[PDB]
Each structure stands twice: as C-alpha cells, then as structure tokens.
Structure 1
Amino acid sequence: QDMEGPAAVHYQPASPPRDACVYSSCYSEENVWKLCEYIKNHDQYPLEECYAVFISNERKMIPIWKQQARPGDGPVIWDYHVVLLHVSSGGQSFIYDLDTVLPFPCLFDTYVEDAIKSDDDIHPQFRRKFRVICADSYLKNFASDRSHMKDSSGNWREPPPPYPCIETGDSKMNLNDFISMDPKVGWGAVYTLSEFTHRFGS
C-alpha cells in the first residue's frame, strides 16, 4: 500500500451532464466553443482556468482511442479533434470530450493514457500535437463559416449545428489557423504529446 491533496476527489463538473450539452457530431470545434460560452455565462468557474485543445498533426490524420464513433478497442482516425481542458483550482486537470466513451469529464492522466496512448510505438507521422488556446481567447477569436463541411455542390457532409455560424468582427473563417500545428499561425501554444503532458499533468 502507498498513500498518495484531496481537492480532485470532490471536483464538480464545469458543464451540464453530457446528454444536456450542445452537441453536433463532427463539429467538435463548435461543441467546445459552446462549452466555453456556458462556462463564461455561468457563475461556477472562470474561463481563465479553461483551454480549448485542438489535436492534429501535419498530415491531419490522428488516432484517438475510446471514441464513441468506433466502439471497441481500436482508434478513430480524425483529421483533427477538439476537447476542453479545465485546470482546477487544486491543480488537477480535467478533459471534457463530448465524443469520448471515457467519463465526462475525465481526469487528465486517464485521458492521455487511455484515449491518446503513448506515441512511442506509433509511426511518427501519426503522432499527436496539441494547440492549447485559453478559452477567453478562443471565444474572442474563433470563426468558422462551416465551408469545410460542404461538398463542391454546397451539400452538407454532416448535418450542421442548429445555430448560425460563429463569427467575429475580425473574421468569418479561421478554422485552419486552429487545426494547423504550426506555431507561426493562429493563437495559443503548440505542444508535442510530451510537452502537453509535462505542462498539464499532475
């Protein structure tokens, strides 16, 4: 036996339960934006403690395990995926992924170990990178006209969320600046998996 504060033991979620959250399949960037808006407009936590996390890589092909789209022990290969990270007051980070089969929210270490897994045995060009944007900056700067979700005829590849596109005074479409893992582009900070776990892990 070994003894391991207890703050994480009583952590209260920053979101509604998973089934009560605004959600559209294949629009995780918007599902997370909507979680950020909820946190901002409610009186439980400050957005300063929260981050939007884009996961992708140069080839836009990332495996993520424990995904609802592929029940079982294999991965979903996404072009990108977006989750919300909350750094709780006591220091423990939590991941909010509406698309995971893991708990919602999930302790950071368990999400990284079970949904992300080690990059050590993954072929290097499939390895995961993480663009971390403070949630305030995400709400201030994110814009998507959903044009990436339409074929050349304008037909939707997946049904759109039930509210108008997110726009700012500066832009109507900058989604590629969040998907990109080039630090020369966009907002926040880009991390390798090891850098990401070093920054947020307990």
Structure 2
Amino acid sequence: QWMEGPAAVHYQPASPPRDACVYSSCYSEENVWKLCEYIKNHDQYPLEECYAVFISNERKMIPIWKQQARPGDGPVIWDYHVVLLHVSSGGQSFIYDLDTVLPFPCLFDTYVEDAIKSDDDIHPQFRRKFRVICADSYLKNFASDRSHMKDSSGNWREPPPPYPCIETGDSKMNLNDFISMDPKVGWGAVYTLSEFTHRFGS
C-alpha cells in the first residue's frame, strides 16, 4: 500500500457536463473561451483559479492521445490544441478538454500521463510546449476572426461556431500570439512539458 502524502475527492465541476457545453470541432480555442465565460458568470469559482492552456510547438505539429477525433491508442497530430486548467484552492489541478475521451473534467496528472505522455522518447520536432494564460486575461485579450479556418478560395474548412467572432477593443485577430510558444510574444507563461508538469502536477 502507498498512502498519498487536500485531496479534492468531492470536487464540483466548474462547467456543465461535456455534452451540455458549447462546442465546435477544430475551434478548441473558442470552446475554452466559452468555458471561461461560463465560469466568470456562474459565480462558483474565482476566475483567477483557471487558465487557458495552448499546446503547440515551433513546427505546429503536436501529438495528443485520448482524443475523440481518433479513437484507439494513437495520437491526433494537431497544429495546436487548447484546454482549460482549473487549479482548485487546495492545489489539485483539473483539465477540461471537450475533445478528450478521458473524463471531463480529468485530474491533471492523469491527463498528462494518458493524453500527453512523456516527451523523452518522442522525436524532438513533435515535443510539446504549453502557454498558460490566466482565464481573466484570456477573456480580456483573446480575439479571432476565424480567417485561419478558410481554404485557398475563402471557404470554411470546418463549420464555424454558431455565434459572432470573439473580438476586443484592441484586436479582431491575435490567435497567432497564443499559438506561438515564443515567450517574447503574447500573454501568460510558456513552459516545456517537464516545466508544465513540475509547475502544476502532484
């Protein structure tokens, strides 16, 4: 037997159940934005306990396992993917990924173990980096005009979410500043995989 050395065993999700959440395939940045907006207006948890987490790398090719778009034990190769992280007040973190086949929400360590996996044996150009943005800052600063989702003739590659493009007073499109893993760009903090797990894991 091994006893763990505040466990959030009664943790109440910060979002509605997965199938009740606003969701569009291939717009995870907006799906997460909508979760942040829900948390802000629901008055259950301080928004500052939550973060948007962009996952990407310099070559924009990252594997993520346990993804609904590819059932089985293989990864989806994304250009980037976004999830929500809730650091609950006791310190236990949870990941909210509407695209995972793991639970929604899922304990942080389990998500990293099963969906992310170690980078140590991954071919280096596929290794994962993480940009972590406070959910308050994400709601205040994110903007996307969805222009990256159109083909060479201007037609949608994937159908857009059923509400107007997210914009701010400062920008109508800055999605590249969140996908970028250059710490000199954008908002929040950039972590390698091992730095990310060291920071938020058990």
Provide the TM-score with structure 1 as the length reference. Answer: 0.98
- What stretches of structure 2 of length at least 5 have no aligned partner? none
Residues 114-153 of structure 1 mapped to structure 2, 5 A cutoff: 114-153=114-153
Q: Aligned-pair RMSD on alpha carbons?
A: 0.8
Matched-pair contact (CA < 8 Å) for 2:50–2:135: yes
User: What SS does structure 2 have at the residue aligned with 1:131?
Assistant: strand
Alpha-carbon distance, 1:3 to partner: 1.9
- What stretches of structure 1 of length at least 5 have no aligned partner? none
CA distance in 1 between partners of 2:58 and 2:145 (Å):
22
Runs of 4+ in 1 over 6 A off after TM superposition: none
Q: What fraction of aligned residue pairs are identical, expressed as a percent?
A: 100
User: What SS does structure 2 have at the residue aligned with 1:151?
Assistant: coil
Alpha-carbon distance, 1:120 to partner: 0.7
String of CA shifts for 1:81-131, please: whole Å, max 9, x gaps: 000000001100000000000000000000001000000110111100000
Matched-pair contact (CA < 8 Å) for 2:64–2:115: yes
Matched-pair contact (CA < 8 Å) for 2:40–2:47: yes
CA distance in 2 between partners of 1:32 and 1:149 (Å):
17
Alpha-carbon distance, 1:151 to partner: 1.3
String of CA shifts for 1:42-74, please: whole Å, max 9, x gaps: 021011000000000000000000000000000
Aligned length in residues = 202
Alpha-carbon distance, 1:184 to partner: 0.8
Alpha-carbon distance, 1:152 to partner: 2.4
Matched-pair contact (CA < 8 Å) for 2:6–2:91: no
CA distance in 2 between partners of 1:86 and 1:4 (Å):
21
Q: What's 1:72 paired with?
A: 72
Q: What's 1:155 paired with?
A: 155
String of CA shifts for 1:172-192, please: whole Å, max 9, x gaps: 000000000000110000000
Matched-pair contact (CA < 8 Å) for 2:142–2:167: yes
Alpha-carbon distance, 1:4 to partner: 1.6
Matched-pair contact (CA < 8 Å) for 2:52–2:135: yes
Matched-pair contact (CA < 8 Å) for 2:133–2:188: yes
CA distance in 2 between partners of 1:6 and 1:131 (Å):
27
String of CA shifts for 1:8-54, please: whole Å, max 9, x gaps: 11101000000000000000000000000000000210110000000
Alpha-carbon distance, 1:6 to partner: 4.9
User: What SS does structure 2 have at the residue aligned with 1:7?
Assistant: coil
Q: What's 1:45 paired with?
A: 45
Provide the TM-score with structure 2 as the length reference. Answer: 0.98
CA distance in 2 between partners of 1:59 and 1:93 (Å):
28
CA distance in 2 between partners of 1:177 and 1:120 (Å):
27
CA distance in 1 between partners of 2:49 and 2:5 (Å):
19
Matched-pair contact (CA < 8 Å) for 2:66–2:75: yes
Alpha-carbon distance, 1:5 to partner: 7.6
CA distance in 1 between partners of 2:134 and 2:2 (Å):
36
User: What SS does structure 1 have at the residue aligned with 2:9?
Assistant: helix
Alpha-carbon distance, 1:2 to partner: 2.2
Change (3 A) 1:13 1:153: same
Change (3 A) 1:72 1:139: same
CA distance in 2 between partners of 1:7 and 1:112 (Å):
18
